[PDB]
Amino acid sequence: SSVALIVGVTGIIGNSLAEILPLADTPGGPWKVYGVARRTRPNPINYVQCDISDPDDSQAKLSPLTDVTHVFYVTWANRSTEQENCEANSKMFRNVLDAVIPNCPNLKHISLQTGRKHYMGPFEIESHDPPYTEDLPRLKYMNFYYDLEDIMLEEVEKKEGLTWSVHRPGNIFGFSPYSMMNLVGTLCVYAAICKHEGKVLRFTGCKAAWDGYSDCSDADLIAEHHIWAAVDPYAKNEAFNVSNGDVFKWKHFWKVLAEQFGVECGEYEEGVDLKLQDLMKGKEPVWEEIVRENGLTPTKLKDVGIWWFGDVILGNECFLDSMNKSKEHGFLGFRNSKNAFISWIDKAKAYKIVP
Numbered sequence: 001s002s003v004a005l006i007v008g009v010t011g012i013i014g015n016s017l018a019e020i021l022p023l024a025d026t027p028g029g030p031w032k033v034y035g036v037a038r039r040t041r042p043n044p045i046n047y048v049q050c051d052i053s054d055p056d057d058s059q060a061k062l063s064p065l066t067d068v069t070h071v072f073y074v075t076w077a078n079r080s081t082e083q084e085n086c087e088a089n090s091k092m093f094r095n096v097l098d099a100v101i102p103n104c105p106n107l108k109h110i111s112l113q114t115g116r117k118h119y120m121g122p123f124e125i126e127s128h129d130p131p132y133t134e135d136l137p138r139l140k141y142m143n144f145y146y147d148l149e150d151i152m153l154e155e156v157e158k159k160e161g162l163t164w165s166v167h168r169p170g171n172i173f174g175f176s177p178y179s180m181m182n183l184v185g186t187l188c189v190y191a192a193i194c195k196h197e198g199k200v201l202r203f204t205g206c207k208a209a210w211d212g213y214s215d216c217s218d219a220d221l222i223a224e225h226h227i228w229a230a231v232d233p234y235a236k237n238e239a240f241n242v243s244n245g246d247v248f249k250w251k252h253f254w255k256v257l258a259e260q261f262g263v264e265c266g267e268y269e270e271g272v273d274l275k276l277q278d279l280m281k282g283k284e285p286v287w288e289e290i291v292r293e294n295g296l297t298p299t300k301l302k303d304v305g306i307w308w309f310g311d312v313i314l315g316n317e318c319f320l321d322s323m324n325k326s327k328e329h330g331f332l333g334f335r336n337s338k339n340a341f342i343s344w345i346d347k348a349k350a351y352k353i354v355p
């Protein structure tokens with residue numbers, strides 16, 4: 001009966017879904033699960049190698065998956081322009097729904113993950129006032145999230161009883177061995193390099209990030225949120241924010257990261273805005289030495305140190321969201337973000353990404 005198709009299983013959320021779904025006490029259980037991704041390689045889950053952006057390969061790989069009941073859409077193309085983000089991401093989404101909906105007679109629910117950029121315009125009101133809420137109108141700017149929702153909504157009409165849910169996290173704290181968008185990983189690699197070079201963990205970000213309130217969204221809680229919507233009647237045909245239930249300051253998270261690598265913590269330096277891309281320019285050889293000296297997973301810096309992403313997060317103000325609707329609709333999940341941050345650092349170490 002309960003059969004998951006995780007679309008993007010090698011990603012950060014894909015991985016959390018991959019670990020949690022098959023567990024004995026998981027709601028909706030016991031689950032059979034398929035994990036789909038572009039890579040070959042690498043256990044209870046039924047792996048399918050598929051390129052979602054190829055109409056033929058999606059037709060070939062997903063049509064035979066006759067028994068799936070719930071799809072979890074957690075993949076995204078990231079392009080140079082937003083217009084391209086729409087062409088690319090729509091094509092992918094359509095390709096999966098066109099391969100699944102016709103061929104799965106027990107399809108109950110598609111769960112779509114987007115993000116907090118639903119609420120955020122380019123710049124450039126027009127804008128929204130935080131904390132962000134779910135059902136206040138869409139901003140007038142182009143946004144591939146909006147396009148994905150409309151596709152989903154349109155495709156839900158072509159089968160009766162088929163439900164949907166949208167999941168909108170903020171900045172994700174998580175892990176996967178292959179992630180190419182890992183904030184926590186990225187900060188671990190920066191910390192590791194500072195330790196190696198005998199340098200202080202200088203703060204690489206703005207003041208609003210250092211001293212303001214921020215939140216974040218745990219990879220495992222986001223997975224639980226997806227699962228909740230799969231099984232809860234009050235979650236059906238609704239969009240929802242997912243964040244941790246608490247608030248933090250980078251001022252304090254920086255010390256925690258410092259402590260986890262035994263490196264001197266830096267403080268907010270007035271008079272700049274300090275970037276990871278700049279500080280880590282030319283560190284490719286230094287990283288290889290760290291990987292060799294310690295018996296690490298053989299990685300290149302560009303695959304584990306995603307600086308532009310970390311800078312985008314640490315160089316801007318964090319606008320908070322609201323968990324009221326999720327709670328009101330019955331999702332009482334939370335995380336203690338400082339503890340979760342330590343936990344995801346530990347996970348980077350356990351997989352020998354970082355020493």
Ligand code: NA
Pocket residue numbers: 218220335340343
């Ligand atoms: Na956690």
